[PDB]
Amino acid sequence: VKDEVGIRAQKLFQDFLEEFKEDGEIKYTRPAASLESPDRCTLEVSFEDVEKYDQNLATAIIEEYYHIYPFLCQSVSNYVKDRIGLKTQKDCYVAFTEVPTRKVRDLTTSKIGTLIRISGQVVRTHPVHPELVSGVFMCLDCQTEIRNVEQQFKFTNPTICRNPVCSNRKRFMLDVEKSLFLDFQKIRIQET
Amino acid sequence: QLVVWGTNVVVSQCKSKFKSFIMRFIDPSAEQDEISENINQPLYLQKLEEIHTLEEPYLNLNCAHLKTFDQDLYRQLICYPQEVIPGFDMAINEMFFERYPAALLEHQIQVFNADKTRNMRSLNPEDMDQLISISGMVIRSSNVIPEMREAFFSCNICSFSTTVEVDRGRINQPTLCTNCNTNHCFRLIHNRSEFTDKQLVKLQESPDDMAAGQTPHNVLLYAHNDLVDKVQPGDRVTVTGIYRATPLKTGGLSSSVKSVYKTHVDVVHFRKFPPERVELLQLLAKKPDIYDRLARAIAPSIYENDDIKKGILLQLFGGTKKKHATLGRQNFRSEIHLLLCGDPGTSKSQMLQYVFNLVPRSQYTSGRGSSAVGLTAYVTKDPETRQLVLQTGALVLADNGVCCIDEFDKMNDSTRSVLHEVMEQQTLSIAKAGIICQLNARTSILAAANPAESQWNKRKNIIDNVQLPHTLLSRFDLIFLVLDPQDEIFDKRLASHLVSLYYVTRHEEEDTMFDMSVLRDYIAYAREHLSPTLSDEAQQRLIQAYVDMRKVGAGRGQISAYPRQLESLIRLSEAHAKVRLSNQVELLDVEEAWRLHREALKQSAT
DNA sequence: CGTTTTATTTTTTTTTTTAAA
Ligand SMILES: Nc1ncnc2c1ncn2[C@@H]1O[C@H](COP(=O)(O)OP(=O)(O)OP(=O)(O)O)[C@@H](O)[C@H]1O
């Protein structure tokens, strides 16, 4: 796998955040300590960190963001497991900051996967409108447990088979209830 | 003889022919044909100096030089032009090494500009894949829409994370991706790939050759990835391009197709400082004839009250701001606006047409033909889902341009009162139920104001005449008179001059030399590296003479000044300093105000 | 060597326009 580059960027990620970060102590455990209530999953980490100790390997981080962000979310979980009384129920939310860096005109195809900083106003907005993003099912026959990622926009209820060659259009209706999903909102925003 | 089955074109011929042409090149205009012209090396080698040394990529270049060379190149370039043009780029990408072999040869060039058109009204089956260039005026300002080029795959077991780009639309499927042992079935995902940008805005053809009682017919095309907002939209512009066509999805139940093909044009290019001649720049400033000399140039034939060409003095050597870098407060913009008042069919459009025929920011307007609210971009019905957008206003697209306005006391109260602020504030608060902001735009104003009457009624000081009060009628510095000399004396002159403009059949190059372009460049230098200040000298005049400015205010049916026109005076201060060679304030300039003002301000007899 | 295809209407707010002693 190529993206093991970013997993090593994710090794890099761990390497300083578990180790001495600032102030003679931790920066990123009181977040971790606070997340336990709903399994809150929200954590902010400085991007200057990828300059303090990663030594300007931001360009080993700052390009493959939506590519490897999932893996960074995996790192969040791998952090939590190392000391918290844990089962892998921990999900993803990573909310980087500290980027001395600031626009709509500096946009192209080319700008995918970065962490630029922009500000706008509040207008023309929409409410909470959740998404039961994960879920379970199978084909016509038997294999009724799928903890997979059904969340990519290309998702579909009927699948082909798990253990045996089954139908290819049939579907079960399954565990949308003892599992983990999300919530989100949506707006319009205008140039500062 | 190595060619597409259905064509007659080959890479090597055009490549070699053009490489010889650019080796048959010293600037063949300025070194072979226009030997009386001269910049003596192949310009493209010169550019590979003046591009690489400039380090300033994405060249622009024509190919009308090629008429001297073998015209078969011209033709097969005219007709097969997406399959020869990269070959001429390849020749350039070879020329790199003529002048720098071991460069950072990692960038590419952009690029024609030679062939003709007449109009868009009527074209033909023949004219299908051919080179065209046409012009008009722009309508819209679009957004961007990108376009894909490749598939980035996934896997199930052992990370068969394959990849491959697109010809234009397919990826193949054996049981796995690039069939690697088929541990799982085929995979695809569509994001970690190559994408490509474009837009769409249309043009309105606006020549003097527009057929009789005919409507606008208008054209449009996308961009490519560098040709994307080159464009302050809405002005007189040419394009090059390649006529394109496309079939259409009949109906929409299923894959049926149309008989009729829609068309647009391929997306290429658009159309619009010297240390050499420093001499005359200083020569014209130190010559006191600035008062009239260039002013004498503007009306080419007309003296029409040439104290108005001294009113044209008001106008150019460009216009300095007292922007507020010290304190940051108050945004004191140095705006300029004057009108040309009516009661006689005088040249109050013709000058405004001379201007608009010259300046590109060209518009003509007047009351009762259009709305006051043409800053709207109306949503009468749209190609959207009622996501009601007011894309771009019209009357405000004159960014430091001009809209000419005629017949000014023509409209209702809402019209022409609505604008009581933008004049010296350039703000347009869009506080409606839709999307909201405080926008910016500022420009120049001139019109042909008219009172309730045809002739200025005698016996009757001017504040009585127009139906505006002695705050709003007496508003500006001066809104300038236009009378007939009440006698034959003035009358026959321009008759005698320009009766024979048909019959003169010539033009006289006098000591008031018709400056072909030697004028048009100095003004462009007129604002660059000297910066008019205001110290302690030329300001005490109407500091003190505000006595004289306002103490005529004791009076009704007479009029004094009000404290926005003193601003117009400190704005008058800016122009004359650099030219005549003291960028710090000289005192005479205020006289120009009195030369202007009391020409109709102490004409307050009663 | 078999077994299946395909429809939407009324009200808003803007910018246009239009009415009586
Ligand atoms: N001295 C002059 N030299 C050249 N042209 C003149 C002169 N005096 C008058 N004219 C002509 O008179 C015409 C005046 O009419 P134009 O169409 O500009 O009227 P206007 O200014 O719109 O009239 P109004 O403002 O009263 O409605 C101009 O076209 C101009 O050619």
Please state, in angstroms and rounded to a whole number, the distance separating the CA atoms of residues A4 and B161: 12
Nucleotide nearest residue B390, measured CA to C1':
C14
Enumerate helices (H) and strands (E) in chain B, giving the number of each.
14, 13
B16 is in an annotated binding site: no
Please state, in angstroms and rounded to a whole number, the distance separating the CA atoms of residues B111 and B88: 10
Query: A154 — contact with chain B (CB < 8 Å)?
Result: yes
Long-range contacts of B371-375 (CB under 8 A, 24+ apart): B371/B415, B372/B411, B372/B412, B372/B414, B372/B415, B372/B416, B372/B418, B373/B418, B375/B428
Q: Supply the residue whose CA is at minimum distance from atom 31 of ligand 1.
A: B347
How far from chain centre, in Å, is Cα B103? 37
E strand residue ranges, A76-185: 123-126
Nearest alpha-carbon partner for B463 in B542, B372, B572, B562:
B562
B575 Cα to the center of ligand 1, angstroms: 29
Please state, in angstroms and rounded to a whole number, the distance separating the CA atoms of residues B172 and B186: 9
| B11-23 helix and B71-79 helix, angle to the nearest 10 degrees | 130
Residue whose structure tokens are 């499927």: B173
Please state, in angstroms and rounded to a whole number, the distance separating the CA atoms of residues B3 and B507: 57
Structure tokens at B496: 């005698």
Maximum CA pair distance of chain B? 105
Please state, in angstroms and rounded to a whole number, the distance separating the CA atoms of residues B312 and B591: 16
Q: Which residue of B has its CA nearest to A153?
A: B189
> Does B391 contact strand C, using a CB cutoff of 7 Å?
no
Structure tokens at B274: 């010297």
Instruction: Judge contact between A130 and A139, C-beta under 8 A.
Output: no
Residue whose structure tokens are 């600031």: A102
**Contact check, Cβ <8 Å, A109/B191:** no
Nearest residue, CB atoms, B196 vs list A107, A109, A188: A109
Query: B247 — contact with chain A (CB < 8 Å)?
Result: no
Map residue B133 onto helix, strand or coil: strand
Tell me the torsion sign for CA atoms A15, A19, A23, A24.
negative
Map residue B93 onto helix, strand or coil: helix
Give me the phi and psi of A51, to 5 degrees please: -105, -30
Query: A105 — contact with chain B (CB < 8 Å)?
Result: yes
- Output DSSP code: residue B191: S
Query: B457 — contact with chain A (CB < 8 Å)?
Result: no
> Does B253 contact strand C, using a CB cutoff of 7 Å?
yes
Nearest residue, CB atoms, A124 vs list B196, B225, B435: B435
Q: How close does chain A come to B360, measured CA to CA in Å?
A: 25
Q: What element of type H or E holds B211?
A: none
E strand residue ranges, chain A: 123-126, 186-188
Please state, in angstroms and rounded to a whole number, the distance separating the CA atoms of residues A38 and B120: 66
Please state, in angstroms and rounded to a whole number, the distance separating the CA atoms of residues B439 and A46: 35
* Protein residue nearest nucleotide C13, by CA to C1': B433
Query: C-alpha distances in angstroms, B561 versus A73, B275, B290, B339, B565?
Result: 70, 45, 29, 18, 7
**Contact check, Cβ <8 Å, B225/A1:** no
How far from chain centre, in Å, is Cα B233? 8
Instruction: Judge contact between A44 and A25, C-beta under 8 A.
Output: no
Please state, in angstroms and rounded to a whole number, the distance separating the CA atoms of residues A32 and A39: 10
Please state, in angstroms and rounded to a whole number, the distance separating the CA atoms of residues B557 and B424: 27
Structure tokens at B497: 């001059």
Query: B490 — contact with chain A (CB < 8 Å)?
Result: no
Map residue B549 onto helix, strand or coil: helix
Maximum CA pair distance of chain A? 60
Name residue B102's amino acid: A
Query: B163 — contact with chain A (CB < 8 Å)?
Result: no
Structure tokens at B417: 């009162």
The DSSP bridge pattern shows strands B147-148 and B131-138 to be unpaired
User: CB burial class (10 A; 0-12, 13-18, 19+) of residue A130?
Assistant: exposed
Q: How far is the CA of A150 from the C1' of C21 (A)?
A: 74
Structure tokens at A18: 């578990």
User: CB burial class (10 A; 0-12, 13-18, 19+) of residue B63?
Assistant: buried
Residues in chain B: 606
| B43-50 helix and B85-99 helix, angle to the nearest 10 degrees | 70
Map residue B150 onto helix, strand or coil: strand
> What residues does B263 pair with on adjacent strands?
B245
Instruction: Judge contact between B51 and B59, C-beta under 8 A.
Output: yes
Please state, in angstroms and rounded to a whole number, the distance separating the CA atoms of residues B246 and B222: 14
The DSSP bridge pattern shows strands B402-406 and B362-366 to be parallel
User: CB burial class (10 A; 0-12, 13-18, 19+) of residue A151?
Assistant: middle
Give me the phi and psi of B491, to 5 degrees please: -65, -50
B169 is in an annotated binding site: no
**Contact check, Cβ <8 Å, B196/A154:** no
Nucleotides of C under 7 A from a protein CB: 6, 13-16
Structure tokens at A30: 């009181």
Query: C-alpha distances in angstroms, B114 versus A154, B11, B604?
Result: 49, 21, 62
Gyration radius of chain B's alpha carbons = 31
Q: How close does chain A come to B228, measured CA to CA in Å?
A: 10
Instruction: Judge contact between B381 and B426, C-beta under 8 A.
Output: no
Nearest residue, CB atoms, B436 vs list A109, A112, A123: A123
Residues with CB under 6 A from ligand 1: B 302, 304, 342, 344-350, 406-407, 448, 450, 494
Dihedral Cα B220, B221, B223, B229, nearest 10 deg: 10
| A4-17 helix and A65-81 helix, angle to the nearest 10 degrees | 40
Residues with Cβ within 8 Å of B38's Cβ and at least 6 positions away in sequence, in order, are B27, B30, B31
Q: What element of type H or E holds A158?
A: none
In sequence order, which ranges of B152-292 are alpha helices (DSSP H)?
278-285
Instruction: Judge contact between A79 and A17, C-beta under 8 A.
Output: yes
Instruction: Pick the atom of ligand 1 nearest to B454's CA.
Output: 26
> Does B435 contact strand C, using a CB cutoff of 7 Å?
no
A108 CB neighbour count, 10 Å cutoff: 13
Please state, in angstroms and rounded to a whole number, the distance separating the CA atoms of residues B289 and B287: 5
Q: Supply the residue whose CA is at minimum distance from atom 3 of ligand 1.
A: B304
Phi and psi based region of residue A39 (left: phi greater than 0; alpha: psi -120 to 50; beta: remaining): left
Dihedral Cα A20, A25, A27, A31, nearest 10 deg: 120
B475 CB neighbour count, 10 Å cutoff: 14
Instruction: Judge contact between A174 and A121, C-beta under 8 A.
Output: no
A13 CB neighbour count, 10 Å cutoff: 26
Instruction: Judge contact between B426 and B442, C-beta under 8 A.
Output: yes
Nucleotide nearest residue B371, measured CA to C1':
C15
Q: Which residue of A has its CA nearest to B159?
A: A1
Structure tokens at B291: 């008062």
**Contact check, Cβ <8 Å, A105/B229:** yes
CA geometry: angle at B195 spanning B190 and B196, to 5°? 150
Residues with Cβ within 8 Å of B294's Cβ and at least 6 positions away in sequence, in order, are B316, B515, B519
Nearest alpha-carbon partner for B17 in B59, B77, B100, B101:
B77
Nucleotide nearest residue B386, measured CA to C1':
C12
Nearest alpha-carbon partner for B324 in B570, B579, B587:
B570
Name residue B42's amino acid: P
- How close are the terminal C-alpha atoms of chain A, in Å? 41
- Chain B residues whose CB is inside 8 A of the A124 CB are 435
Q: What is the stated resolution of the deposited model, in angstroms?
A: 4.5
Q: Which residue of B has its CA nearest to A1?
A: B159
Residues with Cβ within 8 Å of B462's Cβ and at least 6 positions away in sequence, in order, are B456, B473, B600, B603
E strand residue ranges, B260-370: 262-265, 269-271, 362-366
Map residue A120 onto helix, strand or coil: strand
Query: C-alpha distances in angstroms, B419 versus B367, B372, B375, B427?
Result: 14, 9, 12, 10
Nucleotide nearest residue B379, measured CA to C1':
C14
Q: Supply the residue whose CA is at minimum distance from atom 25 of ligand 1.
A: B342
Dihedral Cα B47, B48, B49, B51, nearest 10 deg: 70
- How close are the terminal C-alpha atoms of chain B, in Å? 95
Structure tokens at B310: 């001294």
Q: Which residue of A has its CA nearest to B387?
A: A124
Q: What element of type H or E holds B403?
A: strand B402-406
Please state, in angstroms and rounded to a whole number, the distance separating the CA atoms of residues A100 and B34: 55
Map residue B561 onto helix, strand or coil: coil
Give me the phi and psi of B125, to 5 degrees please: -65, -35
- Output DSSP code: residue B395: T
Query: A109 — contact with chain B (CB < 8 Å)?
Result: yes
User: CB burial class (10 A; 0-12, 13-18, 19+) of residue B405?
Assistant: buried
User: CB burial class (10 A; 0-12, 13-18, 19+) of residue A6?
Assistant: buried
**Contact check, Cβ <8 Å, B191/A66:** yes
Residues with Cβ within 8 Å of A9's Cβ and at least 6 positions away in sequence, in order, are A54, A57, A60, A61, A64, A68
Q: What element of type H or E holds B107?
A: none
Map residue A137 onto helix, strand or coil: coil
Please state, in angstroms and rounded to a whole number, the distance separating the CA atoms of residues B534 and A134: 71
**Contact check, Cβ <8 Å, A109/B189:** no
Q: How far is the CA of B217 from the C1' of C13 (A)?
A: 31
Name residue B548's amino acid: D
- Output DSSP code: residue B525: G
How far from chain centre, in Å, is Cα B203? 14
Structure tokens at B391: 């894309």
B119 CB neighbour count, 10 Å cutoff: 13
- Chain B residues whose CB is inside 8 A of the A109 CB are 146, 194-197, 225
User: CB burial class (10 A; 0-12, 13-18, 19+) of residue B268?
Assistant: buried
**Contact check, Cβ <8 Å, A154/B229:** no
Residue whose structure tokens are 């023509």: B410
Please state, in angstroms and rounded to a whole number, the distance separating the CA atoms of residues B553 and B94: 78
